[PDB]
Amino acid sequence: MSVYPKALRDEYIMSKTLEVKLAFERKTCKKVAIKIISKALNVETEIEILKKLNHPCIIKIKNFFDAEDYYIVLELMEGGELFDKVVGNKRLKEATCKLYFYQMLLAVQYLHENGIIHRDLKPENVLLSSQEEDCLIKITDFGHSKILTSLMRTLCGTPTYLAPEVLVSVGTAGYNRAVDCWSLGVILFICLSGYPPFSEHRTQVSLKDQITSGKYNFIPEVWAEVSEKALDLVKKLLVVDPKARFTTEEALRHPWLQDEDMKRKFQDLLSEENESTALPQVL
Ligand SMILES: Cc1ccc2ncnc(N)c2c1
Structure with missing residues (x-):
């Protein structure tokens, strides 16, 4: 018994487990991967690192949600x-x-x-x-x-x-x-x-x-x-x-x-x- 934050549900349709979940961006109908980190300083640094980096052999951050838990949207x-x-x-x-x-x-x-x-x-x-x-x-x-x-x-x-x-x-x-x-x-x-x-x-x-x-x-x-x-x-x-x-x-x-x-x-x-x-x- 739990729910996903309204802001995430607004943009994505959550699916199966891959904590990593399969999701669909509503805008494009494309498959994405959502990393769920339970509940701060390590997450903020990780996001800052991910945003600044641009290499084909490093995962890219597509979106981020700071709610009851941390939600990181990445490339599937x-x-x-x-x-x-x-x-x-x-x-x-x-x-x-x-x-x-x-x-x-x-x-x-x-x-x-x-x-x-x-x-x-x-x-x-x-x-x-x-x-x-x-x-x-x-x-x-x-x-x-x-x-x-x-x-x-x-x-x-x-x-x-x-x-x-x-x-x-x-x-x-x-x-x-x-x-x-x-x-x-x-x-x-x-x-x-x-x-x-x-x-x-x-x-x-x-x-x-x-x-x-x-x-x-x-x-x-x-x-x-x-x-x-x-x-x-x-x-x-x-x-x-x-x-x-x-x-x-x-x-x-x-x-x-x-x-x-x-x-x-x-x-x-x-x-x-x-x-x-x-x-x-x-x-
Ligand atoms: C961190 C991360 C990002 C994308 C993924 N895509 C598929 N399976 C996984 N286990 C994934 C984990």
Whole structure:
């Protein structure tokens, strides 16, 4: 027992669950997706982030409602979550991993260039544009995101009264974005092999110890099917030291991403999505 706000009902007809619901914009009769966040500062920042961003591999906000709960209107993603393509040891073919990963890299590079760190990249936050395996992907869930300081201002003065831990923190400052590159490394491992790199399944070593040591579970039988280049990129993103860890630029320059065929398929999917909204141009 509950109702939708009158302002939402005015513009949309709510439907099935995908908290995410299928809805229809009355004006166009087009399918939309409505994210319902229960009841503030994280939602306002998320909306502000979503509105400012403009990239084909990042979800766009269509509308927003601040009522009994928060209602976020987004583009519908027919393919659903990437999670559903990797769940229960299901694995994607290398070429599919590459097409998807390239887009995730472009999306995360864009975020980083724009002073945004996602902080929660997972297969459940990566959505697919269609039920076809060759599709566009979009990064979602900016609820844990951070905007890129008090350290810089502190450094301007004389450190007469400054604590040693603050001066020691100068070595590693400005490397928070590297958390996204680690997550991408974990996502890539899962896509390639169908299993997680770090887990509490059939092991004595604790999840914390596996992650800090950077000793992922390597199953040769599973990995033999995967190329040496794809595994080399995983290895370079799964680096413990955030200062040594591969950035989005380094990952995009890696030999595994140097595939003209995959890049062509991406641009082809791009023009296909844009064709419906393309306005005549000055020749
Ligand atoms: C965040 C968001 C946006 C669009 C979606 N479209 C389909 N299925 C989902 N689970 C979706 C989630």
